[PDB]
Design an enzyme around this catalytic site. Structure first.
Site: not given
Ligand SMILES: O=C(O)[C@H]1O[C@@H](N2CCC(=C3c4ccc(Cl)cc4CCc4cc(O)cnc43)CC2)[C@H](O)[C@@H](O)[C@@H]1O
Ligand SMILES: O=C(O)[C@H]1O[C@@H](N2CCC(=C3c4ccc(Cl)cc4CCc4cc(O)cnc43)CC2)[C@H](O)[C@@H](O)[C@@H]1O
Lengths: 581, 581
Positions: A156, A397, A453, A488
């Site tokens: 991201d 992650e 989050y 984070e």
């Molecule tokens: O919240 C950010 O997005 C920031 O925090 C970190 N970030 C955390 C959220 C991330 C996810 C993820 C992974 C597992 C589950 Cl159950 C839910 C979710 C949410 C939505 C989602 C949707 C996707 O398509 C891919 N990845 C996720 C991983 C990424 C990263 O470290 C950072 O790079 C990013 O900018």
């Protein structure tokens, strides 16, 4: 082995930075051998800097493939007697250096330095230096790139590429100082802590005398030692401290070459659920950052670095994490001067996810462990002596709770702990969804670093329900007896959107989100740090979930404070660096 | 004489840029001789950059007096055989260079380069380079500072100070190329325009052979000449053109020293009410800019320069004015590469206003003409060869219609026309209130450059009434028969404020303002250029009339387009560089 090129009585340093010749590859670029003749119909491109945002139109921003940097290099023959080296602080992602047409160097890795020798392939007058850069990412790159002609980043943040950091030239005698290492054993027993420093110089060339001199802050000499190895007895040693830094100088005179190094005397040790700096219970205050500014992209930006560190000390922070890639050498050295705790992290982001394949599938999965070991090798070889680096992050992650995951990281953790002269803590940032029982980080890591989050992706906008969840998982993590910190946590906030009865994306909601989370954090004494995400808004790939990039920052992309930024500054003001728990 | 230091087979170039030691003077700074010992309790400050915005708190931003930059310089003895020079691209405002404690150089002038020799005062190992900078402005400085402990700038932009541009070190043989000059006589008579270029090399030192070589765009050689003076016959010469640039290369080999110079073959000539570039009727499209970015302040910013030139070509502009001070050498060279018309302007801004004294009062008025002549001297000595500079601006909005005004500028105009090898047009930017009959620029200047705000300061919000005024004054200016262009005109617009029925400060009003003005402009064929104010929002001193700085820019301070930016892009798209009138 990579030492930071500086200016010394024995060595030079010419910054090749400026406006270079630039040209986007069109496929035929390599067959037509552009690296020999000039760049016909060339464009202008400043170096160092990411090129994606320096021209208008999506075709420059969303380019797929190669771009050709070209420049005119020239050295006076009276310097050919020394050792000529071309140092590239960073090239994102894949670099290929030419000189007059001859491929002289290659490198895989867009966020760490690599150098080459120019003595043999130089000419007499003007030489045509051609640096070709590739931006493609896939299952063999770190960061990892997915698939479904454009790059689909498995991360991201935007795929800023180009000569991200400075390209310089430096010289050195035939027999030179190639590498240096310094560790500190601090005797905290005496009423005044003394210290003994062990050094180790590595020379290279047709050797054979080595001399080392120690200086203090002002520059006064303190001691001297002979040989490629030795020690220093520092009674009344001034310990490098978070927000109260102190750096000694070290002048090593070897043959006809000299090199100086600032060192900070400090100890790092984990003890149960306590992260100890200089044998005191430290609490992380800060946030995960990015190397992201406009229009530089990922390119280096010394002024913003100094401004960010000002904003940090303004906000009463003490630490940050080089989120998702190693930062510039300049920023690391600045954290030594300014006394900022740093969590050095590798580029290992995106190692996650007629059938659904598995992350560590041996045939159709990530093919990154080999390069992943290199990065762990080169990262520590570079920042091993930085007193600000108090821990390593093997990956951000990853799929750390899937089959083959443990087998993938175990050799990486070992390589890390076997390469760090200071034997500093190791960890990996745990994606949301992992638990103490499922996360292979529970066994491999010295400190648990969570990316949670609750109140945004999970639970938002119901902060009440989100709280019970955060508490339930956090309480469980205490079962390990290890130190837990959040690296984070945040909520996307569009600066300027306000509401008395808040909703998601407003500044009011963002503050509430951090109030609920911080409330739970303070309920557990094994939580030794809080780092919000992100320090400031940064650029990502376009998407429905990204409102003109990532807006979870406490500050805007131009470093302006959101209402949350004042919240934290007030909170972190009443929270000390040591003894909080 | 100041040549741009570059990398050549005969000369080096080490960029001293990086994080230096910084310390604010407290008054006792000079008596206690800080320039000898280190900076006790020093701070961190990146160079090059303005320091006002790089730390939090008004005490760093609003500092009054001196600041001390300190750094560690070191050269290998095997280079002492050459000529060592310390080149300061810019120090705002007053610089004082020390080396180990000995005052080696001084300079008055914050926006032009100045160098000094280091051979005699160097040491063997580490040398303490100390650059002290003063920010005070008064009736003896350019820009001019008023009075009613803080600086009160007599200008509308913030007093960013510090090592604004890079500090480098370069070498050269004992007998070196100290200066170069090149003019072009273009024979536009033949069906194909040929050209003859006259050069003139100035050497210095213990002389005695001089060689010059001409190359084209790709790098192919074209001709050769001997002696300190000579010419070149270019049949089928490729003329440098606005937005269609072409630069030849010139390699002068003198003794044991070489230096290359990009030159653009173009002609500039005023003919009645027509500004001719290459003997064609040119129309200025652009805006007055500032060297202002965040948090760099006035400090150099190569990435933003390339982005601005991208935004310009995106917007279909062709020219800008180095508003209120000379810009960096890098930006001038970039305009040669990118083909951007530039109006080089001096630092002479603020020369305006028990009794009310007069601007040019001999005893209690501006004491600036002496330094004013220096700037005109040093400015042309630097940018004389830039094919992008098509005109000089002696001053911005001076008291050009007051007693003693004509006597003040006449020697300056003469000095300018006697120093420009190309004898390019000269002008001064006329503040609002002047008329054709009262403005001493009517006689002294080749082109009339107006700064009018009909629809804002004068007439706003009644654009109808403001129109008759603009028309009445503009029609009068036609009586001179000279070319007229607006170098400034705009309305403060806070990005994001919208209204269907517009009011002042909204994006809608800003567009209407430029519609009314541009309408009148097109009614007169002697108007040969329109440049809006400003290119982007920039920082000023605080005041009730300044909404967090100056917001008259077409783009935001971070280069984001306001609605007006699209308006102009559409207008300038249907307006050509030549033949518009
Ligand atoms: O919240 C950010 O997005 C920031 O925090 C970190 N970030 C955390 C959220 C991330 C996810 C993820 C992974 C597992 C589950 Cl159950 C839910 C979710 C949410 C939505 C989602 C949707 C996707 O398509 C891919 N990845 C996720 C991983 C990424 C990263 O470290 C950072 O790079 C990013 O900018
Ligand atoms: O409009 C800008 O302010 C921009 O345009 C230029 N700018 C033009 C407006 C300026 C004036 C001025 C002078 C004569 C008269 Cl009758 C009215 C006014 C308006 C108000 C006023 C108030 C003062 O206290 C001092 N100076 C003025 C001069 C300055 C400048 O060149 C540029 O630096 C500035 O940013």
């Amino acid at each position: 082995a990579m030492l930071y090129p500086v200016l010394t009585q024995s060595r030079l340093l010419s910054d090749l930075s400026g406006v270079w010749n630039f040209k986007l590859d069109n496929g035929k670029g390599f067959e037509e051998k552009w690296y020999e003749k000039p760049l016909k119909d060339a464009d202008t491109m400043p170096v160092p800097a990411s090129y994606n945002d320096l021209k208008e139109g999506t075709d420059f921003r969303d380019h797929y493939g190669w771009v050709f940097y070209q420049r005119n290099i020239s050295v006076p023959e009276y310097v050919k007697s020394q050792r000529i080296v071309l140092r590239c602080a960073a090239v994102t992602h894949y670099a290929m250096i030419y000189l007059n047409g001859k491929l002289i160097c290659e490198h895989k890795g867009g966020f760490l330095p690599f150098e080459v020798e120019l003595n043999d392939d130089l000419q007499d007058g003007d030489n045509l230096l051609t640096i070709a850069v590739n931006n493609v990412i896939d299952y063999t790159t770190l960061p990892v790139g997915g698939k479904a002609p454009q790059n689909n980043p498995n991360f991201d943040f935007f795929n800023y590429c180009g000569i991200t950091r400075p390209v310089k030239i430096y010289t050195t005698p035939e027999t030179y100082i190639n590498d240096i290492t310094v560790t500190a054993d601090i005797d905290f027993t005496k009423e005044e802590p003394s210290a003994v420093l062990n050094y180790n110089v590595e020379i290279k060339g047709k050797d054979i005398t080595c001399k080392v001199e120690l200086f203090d802050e002002e520059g006064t000499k303190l001691s001297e030692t002979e040989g490629s190895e030795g020690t220093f007895e520092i009674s009344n040693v001034r310990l490098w401290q978070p927000l109260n830094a102190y750096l000694y100088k070290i002048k090593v005179t070897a043959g006809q070459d000299v090199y100086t190094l600032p060192y900070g005397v400090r100890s790092v040790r984990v003890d149960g659920t306590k992260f100890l700096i200089n044998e005191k219970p430290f609490y992380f205050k800060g946030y995960g950052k990015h190397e992201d500014t406009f229009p530089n992209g990922r390119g280096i930006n010394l002024p913003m670095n100094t401004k960010d560190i000002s904003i940090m000390k303004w906000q009463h922070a003490n630490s940050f994490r080089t989120s998702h890639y190693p930062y510039s050498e300049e920023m690391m050295r600045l954290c030594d001067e300014e006394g900022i705790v740093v969590i050095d992290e590798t580029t290992a982001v995106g190692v996650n996810l007629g059938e659904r394949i598995g992350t560590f599938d041996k045939e159709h999965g990530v093919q990154t462990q080999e390069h992943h070991k290199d990065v762990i090798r080169d990262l520590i070889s570079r920042d091993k002596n930085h007193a600000c680096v108090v821990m390593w992050s093997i990956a951000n992650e990853p799929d750390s709770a899937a089959e083959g995951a443990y087998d993938y990281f175990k050799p990486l953790y070992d390589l890390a702990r076997e390469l760090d002269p200071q034997k500093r803590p190791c960890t990996l940032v745990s994606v949301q969804g992992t638990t103490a029982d499922t996360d292979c980080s529970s066994q491999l890591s010295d400190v648990i670093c969570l990316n949670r989050y609750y109140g945004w992706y999970f639970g938002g906008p119901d902060l009440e329900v989100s709280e019970t969840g955060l508490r339930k998982e956090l309480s469980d993590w205490g079962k390990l007896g290890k130190p837990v910190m959040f690296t984070e946590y945040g909520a996307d906030t569009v600066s300027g959107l306000h509401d008395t009865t808040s909703v998601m994306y407003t500044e009011e909601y963002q503050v509430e989100y951090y109030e609920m989370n911080n409330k739970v954090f303070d309920e557990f004494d094994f939580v030794v740090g809080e780092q919000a995400w992100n320090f400031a808004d940064f650029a990502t790939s376009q998407s429905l979930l990204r409102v003109q990039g990532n807006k979870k920052g406490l500050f805007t992309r131009d470093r302006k404070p959101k209402m949350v930024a004042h919240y934290f500054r007030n909170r972190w003001s009443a929270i000390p660096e040591f003894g909080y728990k």
